[PDB]
Design a protein around this motif. Structure first.
Motif, short mmCIF file in Angstrom:
data_model
loop_
_atom_site.label_atom_id
_atom_site.label_comp_id
_atom_site.label_asym_id
_atom_site.label_seq_id
_atom_site.Cartn_x
_atom_site.Cartn_y
_atom_site.Cartn_z
N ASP A 154 0.81 -1.23 0.00
CA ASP A 154 0.00 0.00 0.00
C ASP A 154 0.85 1.29 0.00
O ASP A 154 0.57 2.23 -0.78
CB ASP A 154 -0.95 0.03 1.19
CG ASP A 154 -1.75 -1.27 1.33
OD1 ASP A 154 -2.15 -1.83 0.29
OD2 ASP A 154 -1.97 -1.73 2.48
N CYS A 157 2.12 1.43 -3.66
CA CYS A 157 1.04 1.59 -4.61
C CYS A 157 0.29 2.90 -4.54
O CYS A 157 0.30 3.70 -5.49
CB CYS A 157 0.00 0.54 -4.39
SG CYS A 157 0.47 -1.00 -5.15
N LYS A 158 -0.41 3.09 -3.42
CA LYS A 158 -1.25 4.27 -3.21
C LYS A 158 -0.48 5.61 -3.19
O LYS A 158 -0.87 6.53 -3.87
CB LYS A 158 -2.11 4.06 -1.96
CG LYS A 158 -2.53 5.29 -1.22
CD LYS A 158 -3.62 5.02 -0.13
CE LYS A 158 -5.08 5.21 -0.64
NZ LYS A 158 -5.42 6.63 -0.98
N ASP A 163 -1.41 5.48 -6.86
CA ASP A 163 -2.48 4.59 -7.32
C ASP A 163 -2.46 4.05 -8.72
O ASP A 163 -3.52 3.71 -9.23
CB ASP A 163 -3.83 5.23 -7.12
CG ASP A 163 -4.56 4.62 -5.99
OD1 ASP A 163 -4.20 3.48 -5.70
OD2 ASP A 163 -5.44 5.24 -5.37
#
Length: 449
Positions: A154, A157-158, A163
């Protein structure tokens, strides 16, 4: 009498190599046997049986569409699989990946490891040869890695990649063009689908995650890591970060001047003068090192990005990126990690190649990064609840992440070639006085040029 897979645990690549029926078919053929076809034939035999109880006819149906030329004979199969295209080979590899994709602790994954130079075992294979490769087989640090890794994901990624699309689950990835190496991955960003297939595009990004337990710490009086920690937080920069990397007994980053030979401690290195707090270093001018030396050449002056996170204790629950400090820190080509990342790089490279992924005149070897994640324990100060970024729940039981270092790795094509060569020829070594089938290796892997 369920779970027929337990029954399949004896049907390995090595065992396939020693069956009457392989012997027969290899008795009456023209050259030696060729190696990737062999691996593909065996797999085909494994599944042909596996599918009798799990209805996954994917693999075979395909392998069978190739035998134009109850099933065709060892001979017809070997030949179709011999005339196949790299692209066709890479289709079977993705069948195998998709099958193993869940259950990393499926039993099949084990049967498939036999005969395969895993990327966790590439350097070791290189060091001590392949026997282990043809032999078989949580409340402490390992568990730490295992429930923290997804938070680190996370974060990447985020917030690191704002994202971008990605996937986090990978099954087993055999090297299509030689069928001797394999890998799996933590994480890939920029990645599409084609069915159950994960399709690696030429803008793909690999990340190897590493939570570092030996740095875990607490905001408490007397904790020794906590000060330098606080300091970095307050004043986020190089010299601050040095102090933190160094607050423990055995620092994860080591100074190693040009033309000297780095130790083997762990996988981060630096030439930057600052990181220097004492001594002399055995001369790495290589009577024997042309290989690692190439890589140091290639890699120093890599700059990696330190992202420091917000304490959810002073941002009412929010963990987001507070600082992005660039530093000079790079991979250590003596460490194991360099090797698994090398092969991740090599194999996936191949997948893109053979799945229409690459514009002419342009390179699509993905990029490969290391990620070294630093966490701390939840104190009673911390909000029962936490979010990554502003709106993604941190797991109630995961530790609070504190920092995250990202480190681009760089892989000179000649270094790759040497590594996979020597390791491969070792493979053939063992095969050669173990089997009388001993499959022959692909040229791309013959060693010297």
């Amino acid at each position: 009498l369920e779970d027929p897979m337990e029954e399949m645990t004896s049907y390995t690549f090595a065992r396939f190599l020693r069956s009457p029926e392989t012997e027969a078919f290899v008795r009456n053929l023209d050259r030696p046997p060729q190696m990737p076809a062999m691996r593909f034939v065996y797999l085909y035999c494994l599944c042909k049986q596996i599918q009798e109880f799990s209805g996954e006819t994917g693999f075979c149906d395909f392998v069978s569409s190739l035998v134009q030329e109850d099933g065709p004979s060892l001979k017809s199969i070997y030949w179709g699989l011999q005339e196949a295209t790299d692209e066709q080979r890479t289709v079977l590899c993705s069948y195998v990946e998709s099958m193993t994709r869940g259950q990393s602790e499926n039993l099949m994954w084990d049967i498939l490891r036999n005969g395969i130079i895993s990327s966790s075992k590439l350097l070791s294979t290189i060091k001590n040869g392949p026997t282990k490769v043809f032999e078989p087989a949580f409340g402490g640090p390992v568990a730490f890695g295992l429930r923290c890794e997804d938070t680190v994901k996370d974060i990447v990624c985020k917030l690191i990649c704002g994202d971008a699309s990605a996937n986090r689950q990978f099954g087993f990835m055999i090297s299509p063009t030689d069928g001797i190496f394999g890998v799996s991955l933590d994480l890939c960003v920029n990645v599409e689908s084609q069915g159950d297939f994960i399709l690696f595009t030429d803008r793909s990004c690999i990340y190897e995650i590493k939570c570092r337990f030996k740095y875990l710490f607490s905001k408490s009086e007397f904790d020794p890591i906590y000060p330098s920690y606080t300091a970095l937080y307050k004043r986020p920069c190089k010299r601050s970060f040095i102090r933190f990397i160094n607050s423990i007994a055995r620092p994860t980053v080591e100074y190693v001047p040009d033309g000297r030979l780095p130790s083997e401690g762990d996988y981060l290195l630096t030439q930057d003068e600052a990181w220097n707090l004492k001594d002399v270093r055995k001369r790495k001018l290589g009577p024997g090192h042309d290989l690692v030396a190439d890589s140091l050449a290639a890699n120093r002056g890599v700059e990696s990005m330190l992202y420091v996170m917000t304490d959810p204790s002073e941002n009412a629950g929010r963990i987001g990126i507070k600082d992005r400090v660039p530093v000079n820190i790079f991979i250590n080509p003596r460490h194991n990690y360099f090797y698994q990342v090398l092969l991740q790089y090599k194999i996936v490279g191949d997948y893109v190649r053979h799945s229409g992924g690459g514009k002419p005149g342009r390179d699509c070897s993905p990029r490969v990064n290391i990620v070294t994640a630093f966490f701390r324990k939840r104190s009673p100060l911390d909000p029962a609840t936490c979010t990554l970024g502003s709106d993604l729940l941190l797991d109630a039981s995961v530790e609070i992440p504190v920092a995250v270092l990202v480190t681009p790795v760089v892989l000179p094509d000649s270094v790759i070639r040497k590594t996979l060569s020597t390791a491969a020829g070792s493979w053939k070594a063992y095969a050669d006085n173990t089997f009388d089938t001993a499959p022959w290796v692909p040229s791309g892997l013959f060693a010297d040029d």
